[PDB]
């Protein structure tokens, strides 16, 4: 009968092309991954420029100057915090993937801040496994033109779907019907791409409210 629009954010950095001239295969693998990541960000930006009316209304609230920095302020130390919109609407906010933290701290200092020399293949595979989710999110958004249903595992995993069930404004008997039927509350959910502004990628997930 009712939806529950959450906000899922990803910290997306912007890295200029690394001027490294490296013939090592491990350097080239990381450069290929970075060129795939930058192309994913560019394609995600290119997308932005009915059961989705409740999720678009949050996409346009974040279109205001002074609404995405408040969402960043709240998550500044917590992965799941409640923020207040300009309309007074309370919206759960979730930070799933920190790609800015990984790229700025581990990759950039040893690749572009100095002459490139990568000593580990573990970080090549580790980057490939965390950047992989971002590439899949772009693939489901580019094919479906920004609105993805049924809700996939890449957008919202099962571990992070029971977190937005115990944190919902419903009774403890309606959180029993949805925590035991995860595979049914995923075919009736949505995912709307909202914005890439101020180095943050945010999309809205509409989990349903079963009031009957």
């Amino acid at each position, epitope marked *: 009968t009712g939806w529950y629009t959450s906000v899922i954010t990803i910290e997306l950095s*912007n890295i200029k092309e690394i001027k490294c001239n490296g013939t090592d295969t491990k350097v080239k693998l990381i450069k290929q991954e970075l060129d795939k990541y930058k192309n994913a960000v560019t394609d995600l930006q290119l997308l932005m420029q009915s059961a989705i009316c409740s999720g678009i209304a949050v996409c346009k609230v974040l279109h205001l*100057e*002074g609404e995405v*920095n*408040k969402i*960043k*302020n*709240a998550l*500044l*130390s917590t992965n799941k915090a409640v923020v*207040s919109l*300009s309309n007074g609407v309370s919206v759960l906010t979730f930070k799933v993937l920190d790609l800015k933290n990984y790229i700025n701290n581990r990759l950039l200092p040893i690749l572009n801040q100095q002459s490139c020399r990568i000593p580990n293949i573990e970080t090549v595979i580790e980057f490939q496994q965390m950047n992989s989710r971002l590439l899949e999110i772009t693939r489901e958004f580019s094919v479906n033109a920004g609105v993805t249903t049924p809700l996939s595992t890449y957008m919202l995993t099962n571990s992070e779907l029971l977190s937005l069930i115990n944190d919902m404004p419903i009774t403890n008997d309606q959180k029993k019907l949805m925590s035991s039927n995860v595979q049914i509350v995923r075919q009736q959910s949505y995912s709307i791409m909202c914005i890439i*502004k*101020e*180095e943050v990628l945010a999309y809205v997930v509409q989990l349903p409210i079963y009031g009957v």
Partner: antibody
Amino acid sequence: QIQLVQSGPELKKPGASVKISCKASGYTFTDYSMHWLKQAPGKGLKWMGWITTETGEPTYADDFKGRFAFSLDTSASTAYLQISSLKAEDTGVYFCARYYYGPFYWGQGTLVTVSS
Amino acid sequence: DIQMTQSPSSLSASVGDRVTITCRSSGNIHNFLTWYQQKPGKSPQFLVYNAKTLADGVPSRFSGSGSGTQFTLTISSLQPEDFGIYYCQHFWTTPYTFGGGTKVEIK
């Protein structure tokens, strides 16, 4: 390591114009918009509005309309402030600011002095 | 427009005092407050991210607490390196308004 470098002081006449530049180096200029903050002489701080560094559409506060216009050149990574039809209290210090995680990040001071 | 005010517009503490600087608001702002420390003839650097989080590079002596329509900035123990004019500015919604400005003097 985000840096906002601004212009220097100017000394003008009532009716002249002042062109204040604010160069933002350290981040992709398209992401964050530019906010302008006027300090009154001896008084508190005033907030005029922001200029979107992606589209270029400015918005002003109800007190700062009529003589103030924001402009920018996205290729040079600079933000421009032009004051036309000058008067004698436009004087003070002018700041260019961008959003940090919450509060503002402020530029330096470009004192504007109106003589007679 | 949410309008802010500060009670101790002229504060003069000693070198070992614990002072409180407060703000009100005409409207309700949900834990969206920041404090600036404008040195005399320079640019105002913030000290607090949200009303209960000190900024990076800011001494832990600075701390804030409050939500709704009443806030407070607390200095655990003053030191001579910290003196200036303090402003508290909401960023809930536009236009943003600053406080009257507290000139923390020295006793």
